[PDB]
Design an enzyme around this catalytic site. Structure first.
Site, PDB file in Angstrom:
ATOM      1  N   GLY A  23       0.849  -1.179   0.000  1.00  0.00           N
ATOM      2  CA  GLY A  23       0.000   0.000   0.000  1.00  0.00           C
ATOM      3  C   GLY A  23       0.881   1.224   0.000  1.00  0.00           C
ATOM      4  O   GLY A  23       2.102   1.129   0.125  1.00  0.00           O
ATOM      5  N   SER A  24       0.244   2.380  -0.142  1.00  0.00           N
ATOM      6  CA  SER A  24       1.001   3.619  -0.198  1.00  0.00           C
ATOM      7  C   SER A  24       0.145   4.763   0.319  1.00  0.00           C
ATOM      8  O   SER A  24      -1.082   4.669   0.399  1.00  0.00           O
ATOM      9  CB  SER A  24       1.479   3.921  -1.622  1.00  0.00           C
ATOM     10  OG  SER A  24       0.720   4.977  -2.183  1.00  0.00           O
ATOM     11  N   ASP A  42       1.909   1.112  13.061  1.00  0.00           N
ATOM     12  CA  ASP A  42       1.181   2.246  12.504  1.00  0.00           C
ATOM     13  C   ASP A  42       1.412   2.263  10.997  1.00  0.00           C
ATOM     14  O   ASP A  42       2.539   2.486  10.539  1.00  0.00           O
ATOM     15  CB  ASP A  42       1.618   3.558  13.161  1.00  0.00           C
ATOM     16  CG  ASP A  42       0.664   4.701  12.869  1.00  0.00           C
ATOM     17  OD1 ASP A  42      -0.168   4.572  11.948  1.00  0.00           O
ATOM     18  OD2 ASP A  42       0.753   5.734  13.562  1.00  0.00           O
TER      19      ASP A  42
HETATM   20  C1  LIG Z   1       5.626  10.016  12.526  1.00  0.00           C
HETATM   21  C2  LIG Z   1       5.379   8.865  13.506  1.00  0.00           C
HETATM   22  C3  LIG Z   1       5.337   7.532  13.203  1.00  0.00           C
HETATM   23  N1  LIG Z   1       5.093   6.864  14.318  1.00  0.00           N
HETATM   24  C4  LIG Z   1       4.997   5.538  14.429  1.00  0.00           C
HETATM   25  C5  LIG Z   1       5.471   4.783  13.381  1.00  0.00           C
HETATM   26  C6  LIG Z   1       5.409   3.411  13.431  1.00  0.00           C
HETATM   27  N2  LIG Z   1       5.955   2.685  12.295  1.00  0.00           N
HETATM   28  C7  LIG Z   1       5.582   1.316  11.967  1.00  0.00           C
HETATM   29  O1  LIG Z   1       4.772   0.706  12.582  1.00  0.00           O
HETATM   30  C8  LIG Z   1       6.275   0.674  10.769  1.00  0.00           C
HETATM   31  C9  LIG Z   1       7.363   1.286  10.140  1.00  0.00           C
HETATM   32  C10 LIG Z   1       7.985   0.669   9.057  1.00  0.00           C
HETATM   33  C11 LIG Z   1       7.507  -0.564   8.623  1.00  0.00           C
HETATM   34  C12 LIG Z   1       8.144  -1.304   7.435  1.00  0.00           C
HETATM   35  C13 LIG Z   1       6.432  -1.147   9.270  1.00  0.00           C
HETATM   36  N3  LIG Z   1       5.940  -2.436   8.824  1.00  0.00           N
HETATM   37  C14 LIG Z   1       4.650  -2.531   8.197  1.00  0.00           C
HETATM   38  N4  LIG Z   1       4.002  -1.445   7.734  1.00  0.00           N
HETATM   39  C15 LIG Z   1       2.816  -1.581   7.163  1.00  0.00           C
HETATM   40  C16 LIG Z   1       2.260  -2.817   7.043  1.00  0.00           C
HETATM   41  C17 LIG Z   1       2.925  -3.894   7.515  1.00  0.00           C
HETATM   42  C18 LIG Z   1       2.417  -5.185   7.426  1.00  0.00           C
HETATM   43  C19 LIG Z   1       1.678  -5.571   6.359  1.00  0.00           C
HETATM   44  C20 LIG Z   1       1.215  -6.844   6.310  1.00  0.00           C
HETATM   45  C21 LIG Z   1       1.507  -7.730   7.338  1.00  0.00           C
HETATM   46  N5  LIG Z   1       2.249  -7.342   8.400  1.00  0.00           N
HETATM   47  C22 LIG Z   1       2.713  -6.069   8.453  1.00  0.00           C
HETATM   48  N6  LIG Z   1       4.100  -3.761   8.086  1.00  0.00           N
HETATM   49  C23 LIG Z   1       5.804  -0.552  10.347  1.00  0.00           C
HETATM   50  C24 LIG Z   1       4.898   2.768  14.552  1.00  0.00           C
HETATM   51  C25 LIG Z   1       4.417   3.521  15.616  1.00  0.00           C
HETATM   52  C26 LIG Z   1       3.847   2.787  16.832  1.00  0.00           C
HETATM   53  F1  LIG Z   1       3.391   3.653  17.768  1.00  0.00           F
HETATM   54  F2  LIG Z   1       2.805   1.988  16.456  1.00  0.00           F
HETATM   55  F3  LIG Z   1       4.830   2.024  17.383  1.00  0.00           F
HETATM   56  C27 LIG Z   1       4.476   4.906  15.553  1.00  0.00           C
HETATM   57  C28 LIG Z   1       5.004   7.758  15.317  1.00  0.00           C
HETATM   58  N7  LIG Z   1       5.175   8.988  14.796  1.00  0.00           N
END
Ligand SMILES: Cc1cn(-c2cc(NC(=O)c3ccc(C)c(Nc4nccc(-c5cccnc5)n4)c3)cc(C(F)(F)F)c2)cn1
Length: 331
Positions: free
Chosen positions: A27-28, A160
Site C-alpha cells: 500500500g502507499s 502504525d
Molecule cells: C511520525 C510517527 C510515526 N510513528 C509511528 C510509526 C510506526 N511505524 C511502523 O509501525 C512501521 C514502520 C515501518 C515498517 C516497514 C512497518 N511495517 C509494516 N508497515 C505496514 C504494514 C505492515 C504489514 C503488512 C502486512 C503484514 N504485516 C505487516 N508492516 C511498520 C509505529 C508507531 C507505533 F506507535 F505503532 F509504534 C508509531 C510515530 N510517529
C-alpha cells in the site's frame, strides 16, 4: 556495504540491497509506500517501507527523524520492532531516501488465528503494548484492526500503517479537541474489543457526522459542562442542537458477553477523557485475571523527546536522521 538493485514500484524507484527479494507493493500514502519482501539473509518475510520525500519540509524531516528514533527505541513483544534501516546514498550530500524494515506478519486483526478467552488474550496484548508505548510519552492516535498484526500463535504486535480509522477514533478528536490525552487510544481499544466480541463494527459511521451520532446513540449525549472538556466551539454548538439521547446499558448491547468484559467496556467507552481508564489500569481489571502479570508488563526505558522542542532547518533534521541510519545495529 551491500549491492543495491533498482525496481519501479508504487509509482516510485525502489533501490534496495539484493538481500531483499520478491518485492510486492502492499500500500502507499502521502507518508510512504510499503512492500512485502523476502530477506534471503535471514529467511524471513519482511515489510519494507520507503518514506515518501522525507526531507521535503521541516515537519516531514522532523517526523522522519521522529519515526526512526521511536522505532529504534521500541523493544517490546507487543510493539513492532525494526529489523533494518538503510539508504542507497553513499554520503550525506546525496542522502534523499530512507527505508525501514520490519517483520511481515501473517495476518491482522481483520483476518483471523482462533471465544471469550481469545478476546481476553488479544485485548490483553494490545493493552500490554499500549502501556509500554504510553510510558514512552507517545500517543498512537490511529489504532484500528489493520494496525494490529498477529502471527501464527496469536501473538499480537502494534504498528502504525476499507477499514476506516474514523470508526475507532476517540470522540474528542472527532469534536476537534486539541488537548487530548493518551486515553484516546483506550477509546480505540474499546471499539476494537467490542468488534471482537460481537463480530460487528461498533461505530461504522459513513462520515464525520454519522460517526458522532452513532457514538452518542450508545454513550448518551453530553451535558454542556462535559462538552467544554471534549469539543471546540462549532462542534459544541452542533451537539447542543441534537435531541437528547440517553446512555444505553452496555449489557443489552453486548448481550451474552462476559460481564467483566462489559464492565471494562463501560470504563473504556466514556466521553469524559478524564474519567476514561488508562492502559495500566485496564491491564489490572478482573477481566484479564487469567493473564495479568505485573512483573511481565514492563514500561519503556526513558525516551528522550527533547528534539521535539528543537527549532531546526531541513538540512539539520536530515543530518540527524542520517546519523540515526548509519548507527543502527540490527537485533
Ligand atoms: C511520525 C510517527 C510515526 N510513528 C509511528 C510509526 C510506526 N511505524 C511502523 O509501525 C512501521 C514502520 C515501518 C515498517 C516497514 C512497518 N511495517 C509494516 N508497515 C505496514 C504494514 C505492515 C504489514 C503488512 C502486512 C503484514 N504485516 C505487516 N508492516 C511498520 C509505529 C508507531 C507505533 F506507535 F505503532 F509504534 C508509531 C510515530 N510517529
Amino acid at each position: 556495504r551491500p549491492t543495491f538493485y533498482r525496481q519501479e514500484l508504487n509509482k516510485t524507484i525502489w533501490e534496495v540491497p539484493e538481500r531483499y527479494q520478491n518485492l510486492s507493493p502492499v500500500g502507499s500514502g502521502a507518508y510512504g509506500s510499503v512492500c512485502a519482501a523476502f530477506d534471503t539473509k535471514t529467511g524471513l518475510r519482511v515489510a519494507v517501507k520507503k518514506l515518501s520525500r522525507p526531507f521535503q519540509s521541516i515537519i516531514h524531516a522532523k517526523r522522519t527523524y521522529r519515526e526512526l528514533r521511536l522505532l529504534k527505541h521500541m523493544k517490546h513483544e507487543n510493539v513492532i520492532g525494526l529489523l533494518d534501516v538503510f539508504t542507497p546514498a553513499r554520503s550525506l550530500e546525496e542522502f534523499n531516501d530512507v527505508y525501514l524494515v520490519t517483520h511481515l506478519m501473517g495476518a491482522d486483526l481483520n483476518n483471523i488465528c482462533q471465544t471469550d478467552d481469545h478476546v481476553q488474550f488479544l485485548i490483553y496484548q494490545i493493552l500490554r503494548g499500549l502501556k509500554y508505548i504510553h510510558s514512552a510519552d507517545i500517543i498512537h492516535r490511529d489504532l484500528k484492526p489493520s494496525n494490529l498484526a498477529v502471527n501464527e500463535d496469536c501473538e499480537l504486535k502494534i504498528l502504525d500503517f476499507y477499514v476506516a480509522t474514523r470508526w475507532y477514533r476517540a470522540p474528542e478528536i472527532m469534536l476537534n479537541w486539541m488537548h487530548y490525552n493518551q486515553t484516546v487510544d483506550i477509546w480505540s481499544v474499546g471499539c476494537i474489543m467490542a468488534e471482537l466480541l460481537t463480530g460487528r463494527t461498533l461505530f461504522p459511521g459513513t462520515d464525520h457526522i454519522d460517526q458522532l451520532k452513532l457514538i452518542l446513540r450508545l454513550v448518551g449525549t453530553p451535558g454542556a459542562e462535559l462538552l467544554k472538556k471534549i469539543s471546540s466551539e462549532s462542534a459544541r454548538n452542533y451537539i447542543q442542537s441534537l435531541t437528547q439521547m440517553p446512555k444505553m446499558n452496555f449489557a443489552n448491547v453486548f448481550i451474552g458477553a462476559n460481564p467483566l468484559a462489559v464492565d471494562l467496556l463501560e470504563k473504556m467507552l466514556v466521553l469524559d477523557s478524564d474519567k476514561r481508564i488508562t492502559a495500566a489500569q485496564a491491564l489490572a481489571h478482573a477481566y484479564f485475571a487469567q493473564y495479568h502479570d505485573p512483573d511481565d508488563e514492563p514500561v519503556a526505558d526513558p525516551y528522550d523527546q527533547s528534539f521535539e522542542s528543537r527549532d531546526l532547518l531541513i538540512d539539520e533534521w536530515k543530518s540527524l536522521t542520517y546519523d540515526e541510519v548509519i548507527s543502527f545495529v540490527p537485533p
